Symmetry: C2
Subunit: 290 residues, 2 copies
């Protein structure tokens, strides 16, 4: 019944909840072995993504980037999805990529729903994550009861298929700013003979007592960016999507320029295998603490 394309760190747990909730899934992944835990839960697997699509049915996708979504959602695949078909596109991609693809879906009477997820894999299993939806109202109304199974909050951002994507980029931009201001602040404290952990504990106990600052603050305090939750080069990819998006509506983003340079400089320093949180090491570099 429901096609599910892309079974990475988020696709796997998302698909497991939809199977547990009684939905029939036909799944696919570029790496075929990732789908076998879902076959035990009732799902069916196919060798080619187009074999998973039902004319007028629902297809979910969760892929790494803009090129992965465009490569998969070819004209011939979208045409099979066809009239009244609905694509719930959960990848973190550009508003422009979403609006372009949404346009192609409407050629065949199908609907593209921009559905970026605000959840790390643990938050999905715990169903404490959130989703933003944008696109056709009838199509959002059809899939809203499905996505309620793996998130707490569902936020609607209207008709524009790329609007929810703007919110996701803005959210990730604010996370990156939080990392940077803590790097700066904790380095200033450190060079003043104050432990990074003590300033972190005080400030996030009170003023900055939100999950982003407590989870990311511990990384910045210890300045240990291993194990990896999101690979370092992927932070650069995301801030560049934000900068492109803002530039296209003539909006400067001075903080985002600084974040971008932290990633570029970090790659010059051989930090490609660290977590994206390691952008916060730039403040340590500049203050001579390498």
């Amino acid at each position: 019944k429901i096609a599910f394309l892309g079974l990475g760190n988020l696709g796997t747990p998302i698909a497991e909840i939809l199977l547990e909730a009684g939905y029939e899934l036909v799944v696919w992944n570029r790496t075929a072995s990732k789908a076998e835990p879902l076959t035990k839960l009732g799902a069916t697997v196919v060798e080619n993504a187009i074999d998973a699509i039902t004319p007028g049915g629902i297809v979910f996708s969760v892929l790494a980037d803009d090129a992965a979504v465009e490569e998969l959602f070819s004209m011939e695949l979208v045409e099979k999805l066809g009239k009244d078909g609905v694509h719930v596109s959960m990848s973190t991609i550009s508003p422009e990529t979403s609006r372009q693809l949404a346009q192609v879906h409407e050629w065949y009477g199908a609907h593209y729903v921009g559905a970026p997820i605000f959840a790390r894999p643990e938050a999905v299993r715990a169903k404490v994550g959130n989703i933003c939806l944008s696109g056709n109202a009838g199509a959002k109304e059809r899939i809203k009861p499905i996505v309620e199974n793996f998130v707490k909050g569902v936020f609607d951002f209207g008709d524009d298929p790329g609007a929810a994507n703007v919110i996701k980029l803005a959210g990730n931009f604010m996370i990156a700013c939080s990392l940077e201001m803590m790097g700066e602040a904790f380095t200033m404290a450190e060079k003043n003979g104050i432990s990074r952990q003590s300033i972190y504990e005080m400030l996030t106990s009170t003023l900055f007592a939100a999950p982003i600052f407590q989870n990311y603050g511990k990384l910045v305090a210890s300045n240990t960016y291993e194990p990896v939750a999101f690979r370092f080069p992927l932070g650069l990819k995301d801030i560049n999507l934000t900068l492109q998006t803002a530039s296209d509506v003539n909006a400067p983003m001075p903080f985002a320029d600084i974040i971008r340079n932290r990633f570029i400089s970090g790659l010059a320093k051989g930090r490609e295998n660290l977590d994206w949180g390691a952008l916060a090491l730039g403040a340590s570099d500049d203050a001579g603490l390498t």
Copy 2:
């Protein structure tokens, strides 16, 4: 009770702190509405000081504190005297004053406060303390009456001041990132209110984001809690502090320019939250 306390400075934070100490039973010599609850007023601050006693000060800036804590007054505070300094001042001013205090056998405690006037009135605020161990042991029971959390940052008399400036810096950064993000959304045809509501009820669900985010979402920087030029003064203390320990602060440089440009645009009478208008100006929305 036993401690007859000198309370110097009675502004927006000074008055509600002095109130709680008067209601808790402490005898206060301030420097008229506190005379009503049981205090005694003096004309010259030095006459409020008891040798070996305790003095609280909460003053508007570094200048106000150094001018009041002269060699004369600190000598009068003298042997075993304790000064609890609650002003948002630079660590350098605290460290300089502290050396003056110990030359005459007194102790300076850096004790900047993290609270709006309403958090003080509720005993919900936090305070950071640093300075001499014995002095903090003496005044902790007194500060516990008007704060919830007490955080000890050791012997360095300016270390608590570093935490305070870092906190104010992170608040300014939060205003700036919401200005940038909400302006990007806005120019993509999304209301500032909708992006604000989603992000500040999930990822950024802390009063700092929900309270300042509302101001940034409507670009209405009211009521005036902290005048715009005080934002520039505070970010300048952070930048000086960071420079003295050879630490660049690139976000703070951006914050500073938002205030300088706002003053060029005549915003001196708006709330410091209006630093967030910069993103709108740059995106051609003002």
